[PDB]
């Protein structure tokens, strides 16, 4: 939540389908928050 953390983008396989997931991660608290989840997508 603070420009002091991370952001991950992911390609997750769930139920034989491919999805896009962007997660956040606060440097101090280790507060992960799911941000966007969309799919299915074409494989990279």
């Amino acid at each position: 939540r603070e420009i002091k953390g991370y952001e991950y983008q992911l390609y997750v396989y769930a139920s034989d389908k491919l999805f896009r997931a962007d997660i956040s991660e606060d440097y101090k608290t280790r507060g992960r928050k799911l941000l966007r989840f969309n799919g299915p997508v074409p494989p990279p």
């Binding site: 991370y6 952001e7 991950y8 396989y13 139920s15 992960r32 799911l34």
Partner: protein, 50 residues
Amino acid sequence: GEWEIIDIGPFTQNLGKFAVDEENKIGQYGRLTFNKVIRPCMKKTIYENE
């Protein structure tokens, strides 16, 4: 800020599981069984400037 690629070890497989479990509470896709994290996995690190 910085940007880098990371490897799909059990750290990345964990953010896989969290993303699915978290979708399933808001389950617009019905409900889903996680299967795996594929490459590439990107990771931004933000610093004090917005």
